[PDB]
From Swiss-Prot, chain A:
GO terms for biological process: glutamyl-tRNA aminoacylation. Keywords: Aminoacyl-tRNA synthetase, ATP-binding, Cytoplasm, Ligase, Metal-binding, Nucleotide-binding, Protein biosynthesis, Zinc. The gene is gltX. A motif ('KMSKS' region) lies at residues 251-255. This is Glutamate--tRNA ligase. It comes from Pseudomonas aeruginosa (strain ATCC 15692 / DSM 22644 / CIP 104116 / JCM 14847 / LMG 12228 / 1C / PRS 101 / PAO1). Binds 1 zinc ion per subunit. ATP binds at K254.
From Swiss-Prot, chain B:
One of its GO terms (molecular function) is ATP binding. It comes from Pseudomonas aeruginosa (strain ATCC 15692 / DSM 22644 / CIP 104116 / JCM 14847 / LMG 12228 / 1C / PRS 101 / PAO1). Its main location: cytoplasm. Monomer. It comes from the Bacteria. The keyword Mitochondrion does not apply. Binds 1 zinc ion per subunit. Keywords: Aminoacyl-tRNA synthetase, ATP-binding, Cytoplasm, Ligase, Metal-binding, Nucleotide-binding, Protein biosynthesis, Zinc. Pfam families: Anticodon_2, tRNA-synt_1c. This is Glutamate--tRNA ligase.
Amino acid sequence: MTTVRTRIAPSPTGDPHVGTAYIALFNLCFARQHGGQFILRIEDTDQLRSTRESEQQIYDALRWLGIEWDEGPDVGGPHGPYRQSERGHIYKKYSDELVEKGHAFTCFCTPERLDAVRAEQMARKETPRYDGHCMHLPKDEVQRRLAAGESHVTRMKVPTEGVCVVPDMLRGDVEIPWDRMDMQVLMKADGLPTYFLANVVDDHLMGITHVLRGEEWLPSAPKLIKLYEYFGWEQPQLCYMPLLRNPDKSKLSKRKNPTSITFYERMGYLPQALLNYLGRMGWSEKFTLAEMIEHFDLSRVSLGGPIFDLEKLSWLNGQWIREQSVEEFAREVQKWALNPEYLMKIAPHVQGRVENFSQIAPLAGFFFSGGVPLDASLFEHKKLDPTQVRQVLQLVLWKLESLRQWEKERITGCIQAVAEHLQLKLRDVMPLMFPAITGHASSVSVLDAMEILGADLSRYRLRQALELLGGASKKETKEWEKIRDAIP
Amino acid sequence: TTVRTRIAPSPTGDPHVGTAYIALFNLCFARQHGGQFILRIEDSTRESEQQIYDALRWLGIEWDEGPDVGGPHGPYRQSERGHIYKKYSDELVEKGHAFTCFCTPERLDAVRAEQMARKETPRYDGHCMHLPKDEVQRRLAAGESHVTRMKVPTEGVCVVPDMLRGDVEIPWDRMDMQVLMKADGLPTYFLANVVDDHLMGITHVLRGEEWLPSAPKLIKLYEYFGWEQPQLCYMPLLRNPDKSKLSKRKNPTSITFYERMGYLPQALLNYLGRMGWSEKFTLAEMIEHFDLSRVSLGGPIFDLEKLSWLNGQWIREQSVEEFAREVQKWALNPEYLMKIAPHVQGRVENFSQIAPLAGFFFSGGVPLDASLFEHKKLDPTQVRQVLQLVLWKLESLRQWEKERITGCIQAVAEHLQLKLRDVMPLMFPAITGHASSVSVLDAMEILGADLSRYRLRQALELLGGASKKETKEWEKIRDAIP
Ligand SMILES: [Zn+2]
Ligand SMILES: [Zn+2]
């Protein structure tokens, strides 16, 4: 008679990803199927990559898709806090218990030490693992080194022989040798935990009963199962979902198909269609969230890797567009781009470049086209040969992919940094941005246009221009990455 | 006495730029002297009347008296003014200044033939001028169709005192015997405006140069009646940059064309004022620095490129809010967009595909590519023919709706040796700039009459246009089509 409770636990380290929505949909349907609750927990334990902006992008993207949770950082809940950065005291308590009970230990190995051990191991054809150095430390030495304030971590003990049985709800028993595990770090030197500890503690304290996650987390499942044993906690039911696949059997990557949810919103896809498509890849047709929930059952999940096919997603999205009143269609188009907020940002940039209103559409059309018409001749540069032009586009694209705050000045800073580093003037690079972003050699202010267009469409158009001109080889990619990392 | 000016547009078509030019000067002259400017309709369709009101008001022109705003010296529609016109024509016939004519249209058409064969300007030969009082009483009792004509001198010269040109001499032997009352009991535009100007207290008659040749007949009617003549001024013609007369073949003349193309009314009104007298200024400013003497004796030039530059300055020299409001009214409103919506909803797989598909609804013209007009069962000469004939019949279409637009295109086809399905391949590129697009017939109704004709004409002129031998030959086809 126990109420079901599932969760999605994304890290706010970048754009909201389609994979996250996919897993969130399954955990949502399973909880609603069983009359339970669906929780959202922000795993911002990586305070060097987590941002408050990325947190809100997660909320907006999922809510836009139609996914809603009963408890979370933005709605509250009786089992919070739901941000792992607000639960520091909790993780220390349970990490200390493990050490007290002998199931974990303090490690003082400096980064210079761990690197040396890994080298000596790779030279002995051995599997790289923590050598257990600090596991056999006297209590006298441990007390001393901690009193001096020496940096340290907490590692868990793991078996060296035998096998762990992972009882997947769909695969059955999955045997994983313990010797593939290592003495995983639980508490980092900065007093923050790893997901191994945070997810076990938090899934337990929040009463999570079923955990559907992607199969990428299955290899490390034994360490979580073992942590539950150490605490004497009841383990939740586990199901590891196959990966999303590109139609060519490869893994879903930003190169082949964009993975950002916001990309499909800005491209003009309906949230009902994208959500509907994620469900059709999952289990066993056009349906709403409510209808997908009533017909949901984990057994109907194809044991094969679901395929993300933009062709089928576009056909489905057209079916949704067609199978609704013109009023509904109109309201969706307004929310998408035909609204005063978007149009008034464009207004001041066309007002000075038209002699009558009929010239606005050819000038501002690129604000609504998604991509732009690709004309390779528009990138013939006077000072830059074709190879140098591809280098500039690749370096700019990389820096803009890493840019977290999509704002004109930060956008300009990335481009100007790529140019100054290459001993180029910003005036030498902007002529390439115009055709990439707008499709024309001259247009409105391109830096303003990129901020208005947003990060997703700007990167998409830059990548297409790069691919139009041939792209970059593996050799060039390696050589240009060295340059990327030396740029602010 | 208070100055009183007017315009008397006929509600028989779309309002042309020439009408707004004349209206502006009449409005400015009246305001300068603290008088009234009157709009009179000498009717013809009640819809065409509202077009005139809407187009002139959109420009910023107003009138103190008229059929819509009323006034103390109406009615302001001829059709509402009773049998006042037959009364004055009868006085002229009784006082011997007019006479009754029984000539048949077949006979008046023959005299015109003999006169044009001599390179003469056609005139009424004066047949019925001296018919017996008995012969006329008989035919009238029998109910024979007849009209009333005014008598004009045959020798001498009429001195027309123009406020700008000075004295203009015109020979009476050029004037003809103008019809006063038509065979249907309605007055001619000539008699009605003379009668109505007198009854409405019009003091200054500012007209286009096209009416100068008839000034003697106006002067003589006032003479016959014994009425005080109004001050007269005939404005020089609007001309293209090549010194020719303004023509829809060269530059479009409908006010509504420039509205649908995205010009600001303050800019077109300013351009009409900056052409005549003496640079950007408003209407209230135009009235401030207005004076008739600043008009040049030579015709003003309607230069579209100069108009575009001026419109661009009006767009720039205003707040972004004012600019956005103007763009909303021009085309970015729910009425226009919801007309397009159902025609793109079934043709897109995502919203980012809408703008490439629907862009032609906003581009004024479209990108021209001659290669798009290559037809299987049609040659480069026949394509121009259908385009011309389609254009002509659509230029004559009064009510611009899909069911009547399709009728015109079908009539040109049925009359031709081809089926309707044979012509649409040419319409799609001309109207949308693409080989295929949304329902082109629904698109033309949405785009409007002005932009549809403009694009068809641009397409026709792209492919080469029509020669003189082709036009006169193809018009005979146009007139044989419903
Ligand atoms: Zn250690
Ligand atoms: Zn006669």
